[PDB]
Amino acid sequence: TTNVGDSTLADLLDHSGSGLPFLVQRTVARQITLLECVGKGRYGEVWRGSWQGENVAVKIFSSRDEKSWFRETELYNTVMLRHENILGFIASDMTSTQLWLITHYHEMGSLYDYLQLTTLDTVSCLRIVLSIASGLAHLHIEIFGTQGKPAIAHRDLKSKNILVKKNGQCCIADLGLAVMHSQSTNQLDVGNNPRVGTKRYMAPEVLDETIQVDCFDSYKRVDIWAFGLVLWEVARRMVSNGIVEDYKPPFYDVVPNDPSFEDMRKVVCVDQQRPNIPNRWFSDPTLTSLAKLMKECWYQNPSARLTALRIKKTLTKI
Amino acid sequence: GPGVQVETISPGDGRTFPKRGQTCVVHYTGMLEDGKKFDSSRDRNKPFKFMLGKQEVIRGWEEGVAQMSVGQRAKLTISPDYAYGATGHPGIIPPHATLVFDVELLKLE
Ligand SMILES: Nc1ncc(C2=CCC([C@@]34C[C@@H]3CN(C3CCOCC3)C4)=CC2)cc1C(=O)N[C@]12CC[C@](O)(CC1)CC2
């Protein structure tokens, strides 16, 4: 079945955007064999597929989320986004209308599901949170030059959008709501997607609609708030002194499943509630440090929140 | 044929034309109407392969390359309905774009 001249995906990606060369995207997409549905959500569905004996993830968008396919394809094709903690893009294709986004396949699945299948030790907990911070700082920071990238904010960071890699590090996925900014022109590219962030993870300024929509920095602070919530979800699963918390989403005790904007606004804005820090975390040095970081992501004033780079540096010292 | 104009740069053998099920091995350079290059197998030094009739490439390519003989180099001007249409390809090809490809049919496999 192998022919002389055949290339693997690694060779085709070694070369202009984040994925395969433009025409090669359609050819490879139309040669994939779909194998198993590994996820479903608002976005549509995600499948394990194979191309020439290699696994890939195929995201098939719902008719309701076509603007996220457009935005995510636009971002990965216009910016060279290649980083160990950012989900690697391979191809996008249009083939009823079907919209496909093909990326690297991470057999361990999402962090949200992973936290429900196992507990963590200091090693696995710190590897997870440091890798998320590294990917988030890489998105947020602008790199100048032809090997550069504009600054990018995610706008929908959450445990379901983070994938666990075989090595235990994570990568950040779903750039369908991302915003871009470049210091050279002060141009803010917000896009045309009417989609909004996941309600449970929305920052107070998004829920009360006081966020300054024409300010790139505001979108970075929204990501930092959501990062703090993800930190809290992960830290709960790290065992310390024979004790561990069950997996719970943020605000599990005060809002229902599928909370409304008003359920969230009352908890976060009106009552200024934040996730509770379990007493046992103060007996463990790693969790004591993470509780300090989390709280610095959760100030009501977005300006007081720390940067992704300051989080990454703090985590590197633990 | 509709949707694609074929302007020959250098001739092929004039007898070996691609058939359905054959693999076309080509070198290409793709540009927008304003000459902006968006993709080139020549820059990668790696020929591109596709099976004729499998719809692995845009319609303009299937029908334009089918009119070429082995060894031929030609400039294909493809109308948007025979390429990426109203959507284009986000971040690369804008909506309703006419695409120009300099294509060389290297061999058939
Ligand atoms: N790129 C990807 N790669 C792989 C997946 C998988 C997801 C889930 C699974 C498992 C169900 C099958 C069994 N298994 C267990 C087996 C025992 O051991 C522990 C794990 C986990 C396997 C693979 C998803 C994406 C992706 O893109 N996911 C999304 C989720 C949400 C979003 O918005 C952004 C990223 C769209 C798609």
Short mmCIF file of C-alpha atoms and ligand atoms in Angstrom, two decimals:
data_model
loop_
_atom_site.label_atom_id
_atom_site.label_comp_id
_atom_site.label_asym_id
_atom_site.label_seq_id
_atom_site.Cartn_x
_atom_site.Cartn_y
_atom_site.Cartn_z
CA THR A 1 0.00 0.00 0.00
CA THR A 2 3.04 2.35 0.43
CA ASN A 3 4.37 3.92 -2.78
CA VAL A 4 7.77 5.54 -3.50
CA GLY A 5 7.38 9.30 -2.94
CA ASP A 6 4.73 8.96 -0.21
CA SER A 7 5.05 11.46 2.64
CA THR A 8 3.82 11.20 6.20
CA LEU A 9 1.83 14.09 7.83
CA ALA A 10 5.02 15.21 9.65
CA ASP A 11 6.83 15.62 6.30
CA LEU A 12 3.86 17.42 4.67
CA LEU A 13 3.66 19.81 7.70
CA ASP A 14 7.40 20.60 7.46
CA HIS A 15 7.49 23.62 5.12
CA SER A 16 2.27 29.55 4.92
CA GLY A 17 0.01 29.03 7.97
CA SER A 18 -0.02 26.34 10.70
CA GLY A 19 -1.07 23.25 8.72
CA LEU A 20 -0.55 21.50 5.40
CA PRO A 21 0.03 23.45 2.17
CA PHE A 22 -3.26 24.93 0.85
CA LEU A 23 -4.15 22.38 -1.92
CA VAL A 24 -2.84 19.50 0.15
CA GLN A 25 -5.49 20.29 2.86
CA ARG A 26 -8.37 19.19 0.57
CA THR A 27 -6.60 16.10 -0.77
CA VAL A 28 -5.64 14.86 2.72
CA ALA A 29 -9.11 15.71 4.18
CA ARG A 30 -10.81 13.72 1.38
CA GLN A 31 -8.51 10.70 1.92
CA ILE A 32 -9.24 10.32 5.69
CA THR A 33 -11.17 7.27 6.89
CA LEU A 34 -13.49 8.18 9.83
CA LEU A 35 -13.30 5.52 12.54
CA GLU A 36 -14.89 6.44 15.92
CA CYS A 37 -16.86 9.32 17.43
CA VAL A 38 -14.83 10.47 20.44
CA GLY A 39 -16.75 13.67 21.37
CA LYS A 40 -19.90 15.71 20.86
CA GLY A 41 -20.88 19.23 21.92
CA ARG A 42 -22.31 22.57 20.80
CA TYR A 43 -19.65 22.63 18.03
CA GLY A 44 -20.88 19.38 16.43
CA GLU A 45 -18.77 16.21 16.77
CA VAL A 46 -15.18 15.00 16.84
CA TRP A 47 -13.96 11.72 15.39
CA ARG A 48 -10.82 9.66 15.42
CA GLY A 49 -9.88 9.27 11.76
CA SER A 50 -6.94 7.70 9.92
CA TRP A 51 -4.85 8.92 6.95
CA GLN A 52 -2.21 6.50 5.61
CA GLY A 53 -2.08 4.59 8.91
CA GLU A 54 -1.81 7.79 11.03
CA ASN A 55 -4.47 8.91 13.54
CA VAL A 56 -5.99 12.36 13.20
CA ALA A 57 -8.93 14.13 14.88
CA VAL A 58 -11.73 15.22 12.56
CA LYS A 59 -14.01 17.93 13.95
CA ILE A 60 -17.32 18.03 11.97
CA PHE A 61 -19.14 21.26 12.69
CA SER A 62 -22.86 21.57 13.40
CA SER A 63 -24.89 23.80 11.05
CA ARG A 64 -25.34 26.09 14.14
CA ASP A 65 -21.55 26.68 14.52
CA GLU A 66 -20.36 27.41 10.92
CA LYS A 67 -18.90 30.79 11.97
CA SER A 68 -16.55 29.01 14.45
CA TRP A 69 -15.26 26.80 11.56
CA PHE A 70 -14.63 29.96 9.51
CA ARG A 71 -12.85 31.76 12.34
CA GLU A 72 -10.71 28.82 13.52
CA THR A 73 -9.67 27.99 9.87
CA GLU A 74 -8.88 31.67 9.27
CA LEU A 75 -6.69 31.87 12.39
CA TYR A 76 -4.67 28.68 11.81
CA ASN A 77 -4.17 29.55 8.12
CA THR A 78 -3.07 33.17 8.73
CA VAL A 79 -0.89 32.67 11.82
CA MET A 80 1.91 30.13 12.18
CA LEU A 81 0.75 28.62 15.47
CA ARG A 82 3.01 25.75 16.31
CA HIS A 83 3.53 25.06 19.98
CA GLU A 84 3.59 21.95 22.18
CA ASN A 85 0.71 23.29 24.32
CA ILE A 86 -1.56 24.47 21.46
CA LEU A 87 -3.61 21.86 19.51
CA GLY A 88 -1.81 21.31 16.18
CA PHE A 89 -3.85 22.13 13.10
CA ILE A 90 -3.48 19.93 10.00
CA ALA A 91 -6.24 20.95 7.53
CA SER A 92 -9.64 22.50 6.95
CA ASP A 93 -12.06 21.41 4.22
CA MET A 94 -15.61 22.08 3.01
CA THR A 95 -17.40 19.03 1.47
CA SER A 96 -25.45 18.67 2.82
CA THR A 97 -22.58 21.13 3.50
CA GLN A 98 -19.98 19.52 5.80
CA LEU A 99 -17.29 21.68 7.45
CA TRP A 100 -14.21 19.75 8.64
CA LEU A 101 -11.28 20.84 10.79
CA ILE A 102 -8.50 18.23 11.08
CA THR A 103 -6.00 18.36 13.92
CA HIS A 104 -3.55 16.11 15.81
CA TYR A 105 -5.26 13.26 17.73
CA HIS A 106 -4.79 13.03 21.54
CA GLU A 107 -5.98 9.59 22.60
CA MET A 108 -6.13 10.55 26.34
CA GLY A 109 -9.07 12.90 25.64
CA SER A 110 -10.08 16.17 27.33
CA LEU A 111 -8.88 17.39 30.73
CA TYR A 112 -12.52 17.59 31.88
CA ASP A 113 -13.03 13.81 31.31
CA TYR A 114 -9.49 12.98 32.47
CA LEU A 115 -10.05 14.62 35.89
CA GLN A 116 -13.08 12.28 36.34
CA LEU A 117 -11.13 9.09 35.51
CA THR A 118 -8.14 9.65 37.86
CA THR A 119 -6.59 11.51 40.80
CA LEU A 120 -3.28 13.43 40.42
CA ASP A 121 0.01 13.61 42.32
CA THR A 122 2.29 16.76 42.60
CA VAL A 123 4.12 15.75 39.42
CA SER A 124 1.02 15.27 37.21
CA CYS A 125 -0.87 18.28 38.70
CA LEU A 126 2.05 20.71 38.17
CA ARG A 127 2.76 19.31 34.64
CA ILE A 128 -0.89 19.97 33.69
CA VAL A 129 -1.17 23.51 35.04
CA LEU A 130 2.30 24.57 33.81
CA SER A 131 1.54 23.32 30.27
CA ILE A 132 -1.78 25.21 30.16
CA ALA A 133 0.00 28.40 31.37
CA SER A 134 2.71 27.91 28.70
CA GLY A 135 0.19 27.54 25.86
CA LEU A 136 -1.85 30.51 27.14
CA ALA A 137 1.28 32.74 27.42
CA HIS A 138 2.30 31.67 23.87
CA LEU A 139 -1.17 32.72 22.56
CA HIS A 140 -1.15 36.07 24.48
CA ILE A 141 2.34 37.24 23.54
CA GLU A 142 3.04 38.90 20.19
CA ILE A 143 6.22 37.75 18.38
CA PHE A 144 7.75 40.17 15.85
CA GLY A 145 9.49 39.03 12.65
CA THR A 146 8.53 36.69 9.78
CA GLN A 147 8.60 33.78 12.28
CA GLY A 148 6.26 35.82 14.48
CA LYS A 149 2.61 35.95 15.38
CA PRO A 150 0.04 38.52 16.50
CA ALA A 151 -1.16 38.44 20.13
CA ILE A 152 -4.21 36.14 20.45
CA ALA A 153 -6.87 35.83 23.15
CA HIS A 154 -8.95 32.58 23.32
CA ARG A 155 -12.31 33.74 24.88
CA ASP A 156 -13.53 30.16 25.68
CA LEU A 157 -10.89 28.57 27.90
CA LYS A 158 -12.32 25.65 29.96
CA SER A 159 -11.43 22.06 30.90
CA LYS A 160 -13.46 20.65 27.95
CA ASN A 161 -11.29 22.71 25.52
CA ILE A 162 -7.99 21.40 26.92
CA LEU A 163 -6.64 18.04 25.75
CA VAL A 164 -4.32 15.71 27.67
CA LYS A 165 -1.31 14.54 25.64
CA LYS A 166 0.32 11.10 25.95
CA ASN A 167 3.23 12.72 27.89
CA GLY A 168 0.86 14.21 30.54
CA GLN A 169 1.18 17.79 29.32
CA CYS A 170 -1.93 19.51 27.95
CA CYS A 171 -2.69 21.51 24.84
CA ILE A 172 -5.28 24.22 24.35
CA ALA A 173 -7.87 23.62 21.65
CA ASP A 174 -10.79 25.56 19.94
CA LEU A 175 -9.74 28.90 18.43
CA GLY A 176 -13.21 29.61 16.94
CA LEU A 177 -13.81 32.58 19.23
CA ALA A 178 -10.22 33.92 19.21
CA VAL A 179 -9.30 37.58 18.80
CA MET A 180 -6.04 38.87 17.31
CA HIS A 181 -4.05 42.06 17.82
CA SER A 182 -0.79 43.48 16.47
CA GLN A 183 1.13 46.41 18.06
CA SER A 184 2.44 47.63 14.66
CA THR A 185 -1.02 48.79 13.49
CA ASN A 186 -2.89 48.63 16.82
CA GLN A 187 -5.40 46.63 14.75
CA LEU A 188 -7.85 44.49 16.72
CA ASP A 189 -9.38 41.65 14.72
CA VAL A 190 -12.48 40.47 16.57
CA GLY A 191 -14.17 38.58 13.67
CA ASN A 192 -17.90 38.02 12.99
CA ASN A 193 -18.80 34.99 15.17
CA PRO A 194 -22.04 35.58 17.21
CA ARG A 195 -20.98 32.70 19.55
CA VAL A 196 -20.23 33.69 23.18
CA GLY A 197 -18.08 31.98 25.84
CA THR A 198 -19.27 29.11 28.05
CA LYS A 199 -21.49 30.72 30.70
CA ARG A 200 -19.99 28.90 33.73
CA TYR A 201 -16.54 30.33 32.89
CA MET A 202 -17.55 33.89 31.99
CA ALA A 203 -15.67 36.68 33.81
CA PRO A 204 -17.77 39.23 35.79
CA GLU A 205 -17.21 41.91 33.09
CA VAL A 206 -18.60 39.58 30.38
CA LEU A 207 -21.69 38.69 32.51
CA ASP A 208 -22.47 42.33 33.40
CA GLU A 209 -21.49 43.43 29.82
CA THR A 210 -19.11 46.17 31.04
CA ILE A 211 -16.13 44.61 29.14
CA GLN A 212 -14.48 47.19 26.82
CA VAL A 213 -14.98 45.31 23.51
CA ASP A 214 -12.47 47.39 21.51
CA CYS A 215 -9.57 46.71 23.93
CA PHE A 216 -7.42 43.62 23.25
CA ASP A 217 -6.16 43.59 26.87
CA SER A 218 -9.75 43.06 28.11
CA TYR A 219 -9.91 39.69 26.26
CA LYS A 220 -6.61 38.54 27.82
CA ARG A 221 -8.10 39.25 31.32
CA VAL A 222 -11.18 37.14 30.50
CA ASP A 223 -8.83 34.22 29.65
CA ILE A 224 -6.97 34.71 32.97
CA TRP A 225 -10.28 34.53 34.94
CA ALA A 226 -11.18 31.24 33.13
CA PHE A 227 -7.61 29.90 33.71
CA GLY A 228 -8.08 30.44 37.47
CA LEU A 229 -11.28 28.35 37.35
CA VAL A 230 -9.44 25.56 35.46
CA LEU A 231 -6.60 25.73 38.06
CA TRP A 232 -9.23 25.18 40.79
CA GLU A 233 -10.75 22.17 38.95
CA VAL A 234 -7.32 20.51 38.60
CA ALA A 235 -6.01 21.29 42.12
CA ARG A 236 -9.09 19.58 43.65
CA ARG A 237 -7.97 16.28 42.12
CA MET A 238 -4.40 16.36 43.49
CA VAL A 239 -4.08 14.05 46.51
CA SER A 240 -2.50 15.51 49.67
CA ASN A 241 -2.17 13.62 52.97
CA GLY A 242 -4.56 10.84 51.84
CA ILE A 243 -7.27 13.43 50.99
CA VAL A 244 -8.73 14.40 47.58
CA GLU A 245 -11.90 16.20 46.39
CA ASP A 246 -14.36 14.71 43.92
CA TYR A 247 -14.38 16.26 40.42
CA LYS A 248 -16.77 19.23 40.32
CA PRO A 249 -17.16 22.02 37.72
CA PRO A 250 -16.66 25.63 39.01
CA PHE A 251 -19.74 26.98 40.91
CA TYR A 252 -21.23 23.37 41.17
CA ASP A 253 -22.83 24.22 44.51
CA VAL A 254 -24.57 27.48 43.59
CA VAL A 255 -25.74 27.09 39.94
CA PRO A 256 -27.56 24.24 38.10
CA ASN A 257 -26.28 22.15 35.16
CA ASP A 258 -26.39 24.34 32.00
CA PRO A 259 -26.61 27.59 34.08
CA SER A 260 -28.22 30.62 32.47
CA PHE A 261 -26.45 34.02 32.06
CA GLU A 262 -28.58 35.31 34.98
CA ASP A 263 -27.69 32.34 37.25
CA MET A 264 -23.98 33.17 36.65
CA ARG A 265 -24.40 36.96 36.90
CA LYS A 266 -26.11 36.69 40.31
CA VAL A 267 -23.35 34.42 41.72
CA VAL A 268 -20.24 36.15 40.20
CA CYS A 269 -21.33 39.82 39.90
CA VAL A 270 -24.19 40.46 42.33
CA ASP A 271 -22.95 38.24 45.20
CA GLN A 272 -19.22 38.33 44.20
CA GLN A 273 -18.77 34.66 44.96
CA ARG A 274 -15.67 32.70 43.99
CA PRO A 275 -14.86 28.94 44.21
CA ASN A 276 -14.20 27.80 47.81
CA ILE A 277 -10.71 26.74 48.83
CA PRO A 278 -10.79 23.40 50.72
CA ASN A 279 -9.15 23.64 54.21
CA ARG A 280 -6.82 20.66 53.47
CA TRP A 281 -5.02 22.69 50.71
CA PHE A 282 -3.38 24.91 53.35
CA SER A 283 -1.55 21.82 54.80
CA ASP A 284 0.16 21.14 51.39
CA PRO A 285 2.75 23.62 50.00
CA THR A 286 1.90 23.03 46.27
CA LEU A 287 -1.86 23.52 46.83
CA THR A 288 -1.21 26.54 49.11
CA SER A 289 0.72 28.11 46.19
CA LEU A 290 -2.00 27.24 43.62
CA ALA A 291 -4.74 28.73 45.91
CA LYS A 292 -2.68 31.99 45.96
CA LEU A 293 -2.41 31.98 42.10
CA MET A 294 -6.15 31.19 41.61
CA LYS A 295 -7.19 34.15 43.78
CA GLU A 296 -4.97 36.45 41.71
CA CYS A 297 -6.98 35.39 38.57
CA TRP A 298 -10.33 36.24 40.28
CA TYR A 299 -10.27 39.95 41.12
CA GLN A 300 -13.48 41.79 40.10
CA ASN A 301 -11.28 44.55 38.60
CA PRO A 302 -9.77 42.88 35.49
CA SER A 303 -6.70 45.17 35.65
CA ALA A 304 -5.67 43.63 38.99
CA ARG A 305 -5.41 40.12 37.47
CA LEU A 306 -1.97 38.73 36.78
CA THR A 307 -0.66 37.95 33.25
CA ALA A 308 -0.30 34.46 31.68
CA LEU A 309 3.49 34.98 31.69
CA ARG A 310 3.50 35.76 35.49
CA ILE A 311 1.42 32.56 36.09
CA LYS A 312 3.89 30.47 33.98
CA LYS A 313 6.89 31.91 35.92
CA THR A 314 5.23 31.25 39.29
CA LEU A 315 4.47 27.64 38.26
CA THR A 316 8.05 27.10 37.05
CA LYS A 317 9.27 27.95 40.63
CA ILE A 318 7.01 25.31 42.31
CA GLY B 1 -14.73 23.69 -21.15
CA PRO B 2 -16.68 25.90 -18.72
CA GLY B 3 -15.05 27.29 -15.57
CA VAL B 4 -11.41 26.81 -16.69
CA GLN B 5 -9.21 28.42 -19.43
CA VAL B 6 -6.06 26.48 -20.49
CA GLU B 7 -3.17 28.56 -21.93
CA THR B 8 -0.24 26.29 -22.94
CA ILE B 9 3.27 27.28 -21.83
CA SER B 10 5.01 24.15 -23.23
CA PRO B 11 3.52 21.12 -25.02
CA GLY B 12 3.09 17.61 -23.77
CA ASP B 13 3.37 14.51 -25.99
CA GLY B 14 -0.13 15.35 -27.40
CA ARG B 15 -1.36 11.75 -27.00
CA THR B 16 -1.20 10.66 -23.32
CA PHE B 17 -4.13 12.40 -21.59
CA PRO B 18 -5.17 11.53 -18.01
CA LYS B 19 -7.94 8.99 -17.61
CA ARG B 20 -10.36 8.40 -14.68
CA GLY B 21 -8.58 6.35 -11.97
CA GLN B 22 -5.08 7.41 -13.01
CA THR B 23 -2.90 9.31 -10.58
CA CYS B 24 -1.69 12.68 -11.93
CA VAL B 25 1.74 13.78 -10.72
CA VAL B 26 2.13 17.54 -11.14
CA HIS B 27 4.11 20.63 -10.19
CA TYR B 28 2.00 23.75 -9.56
CA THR B 29 2.10 27.37 -8.50
CA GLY B 30 -1.23 28.93 -7.45
CA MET B 31 -1.89 32.69 -7.45
CA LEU B 32 -4.80 35.08 -6.92
CA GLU B 33 -5.80 37.39 -9.87
CA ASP B 34 -3.52 40.13 -8.50
CA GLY B 35 -0.54 37.71 -8.75
CA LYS B 36 -0.27 36.97 -5.00
CA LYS B 37 1.16 33.43 -4.70
CA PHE B 38 -0.78 31.34 -2.14
CA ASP B 39 0.77 27.86 -2.67
CA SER B 40 3.51 26.18 -4.72
CA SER B 41 4.73 22.58 -4.94
CA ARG B 42 7.79 23.94 -6.86
CA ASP B 43 8.89 25.92 -3.74
CA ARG B 44 8.65 22.69 -1.68
CA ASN B 45 10.53 20.72 -4.44
CA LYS B 46 7.80 18.06 -3.98
CA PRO B 47 5.43 17.01 -6.78
CA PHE B 48 1.70 16.86 -5.91
CA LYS B 49 -0.38 13.74 -6.65
CA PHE B 50 -4.12 13.28 -7.08
CA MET B 51 -6.38 10.59 -8.57
CA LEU B 52 -8.50 11.82 -11.49
CA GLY B 53 -12.23 11.37 -10.82
CA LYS B 54 -11.92 11.13 -7.03
CA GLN B 55 -12.78 14.89 -6.44
CA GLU B 56 -9.65 15.31 -4.28
CA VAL B 57 -8.97 18.68 -6.01
CA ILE B 58 -11.24 21.53 -7.16
CA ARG B 59 -13.39 20.93 -10.24
CA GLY B 60 -11.32 23.35 -12.34
CA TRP B 61 -8.24 21.16 -11.71
CA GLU B 62 -10.01 17.89 -12.55
CA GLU B 63 -11.31 19.30 -15.84
CA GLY B 64 -8.28 21.45 -16.74
CA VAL B 65 -5.62 18.74 -16.08
CA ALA B 66 -7.78 16.18 -18.01
CA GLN B 67 -7.21 18.34 -21.15
CA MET B 68 -3.40 18.25 -20.69
CA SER B 69 -1.03 15.61 -22.09
CA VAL B 70 2.02 14.15 -20.27
CA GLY B 71 4.83 16.74 -20.16
CA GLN B 72 2.56 19.73 -20.82
CA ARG B 73 2.88 22.93 -18.83
CA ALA B 74 -0.13 25.27 -18.89
CA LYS B 75 -1.66 28.23 -17.11
CA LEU B 76 -5.19 27.38 -15.83
CA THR B 77 -7.50 30.32 -15.02
CA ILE B 78 -10.32 28.89 -12.84
CA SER B 79 -13.60 30.72 -12.13
CA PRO B 80 -14.82 30.71 -8.47
CA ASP B 81 -17.70 28.19 -8.99
CA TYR B 82 -15.03 25.67 -10.23
CA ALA B 83 -12.78 26.47 -7.24
CA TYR B 84 -13.65 27.53 -3.61
CA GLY B 85 -16.80 29.55 -4.49
CA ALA B 86 -18.61 31.99 -2.20
CA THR B 87 -16.82 30.78 0.96
CA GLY B 88 -13.27 30.71 -0.36
CA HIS B 89 -10.81 29.11 2.07
CA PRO B 90 -10.69 31.20 5.28
CA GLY B 91 -7.34 32.96 5.69
CA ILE B 92 -6.01 31.96 2.21
CA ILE B 93 -8.56 32.36 -0.64
CA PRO B 94 -11.12 35.20 -0.42
CA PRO B 95 -14.79 34.78 -1.43
CA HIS B 96 -15.57 34.59 -5.20
CA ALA B 97 -11.89 34.34 -6.19
CA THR B 98 -10.66 33.49 -9.68
CA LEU B 99 -7.52 31.36 -9.23
CA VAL B 100 -4.59 31.15 -11.62
CA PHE B 101 -2.41 27.99 -11.60
CA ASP B 102 0.78 27.31 -13.55
CA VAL B 103 0.59 23.50 -13.77
CA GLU B 104 3.00 20.98 -15.28
CA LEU B 105 1.68 17.40 -15.81
CA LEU B 106 4.85 15.42 -14.97
CA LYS B 107 3.59 11.87 -15.31
CA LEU B 108 0.71 9.43 -14.80
CA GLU B 109 0.88 6.58 -12.24
N1 LIG C 1 -7.93 16.51 18.99
C1 LIG C 1 -8.64 15.58 19.71
N2 LIG C 1 -8.02 14.41 19.94
C2 LIG C 1 -8.63 13.41 20.59
C3 LIG C 1 -9.89 13.55 21.16
C4 LIG C 1 -10.41 12.41 21.97
C5 LIG C 1 -11.44 12.61 22.88
C6 LIG C 1 -11.88 11.56 23.68
C7 LIG C 1 -11.34 10.28 23.55
C8 LIG C 1 -11.80 9.15 24.49
C9 LIG C 1 -13.27 8.68 24.51
C10 LIG C 1 -12.14 7.73 24.01
C11 LIG C 1 -11.61 6.76 25.09
N3 LIG C 1 -10.58 7.52 25.85
C12 LIG C 1 -10.11 7.06 27.19
C13 LIG C 1 -9.71 5.55 27.17
C14 LIG C 1 -9.05 5.13 28.51
O1 LIG C 1 -7.95 6.02 28.82
C15 LIG C 1 -8.32 7.39 29.06
C16 LIG C 1 -9.02 8.00 27.81
C17 LIG C 1 -10.94 8.94 25.74
C18 LIG C 1 -10.31 10.06 22.62
C19 LIG C 1 -9.85 11.12 21.83
C20 LIG C 1 -10.53 14.78 21.02
C21 LIG C 1 -9.92 15.80 20.25
C22 LIG C 1 -10.59 17.15 20.10
O2 LIG C 1 -10.21 17.87 19.19
N4 LIG C 1 -11.50 17.50 21.03
C23 LIG C 1 -12.21 18.78 21.07
C24 LIG C 1 -13.14 18.87 22.34
C25 LIG C 1 -13.91 20.23 22.42
C26 LIG C 1 -13.46 21.15 21.23
O3 LIG C 1 -14.13 22.42 21.28
C27 LIG C 1 -11.91 21.36 21.29
C28 LIG C 1 -11.18 19.97 21.23
C29 LIG C 1 -13.77 20.43 19.87
C30 LIG C 1 -13.15 18.99 19.84
#
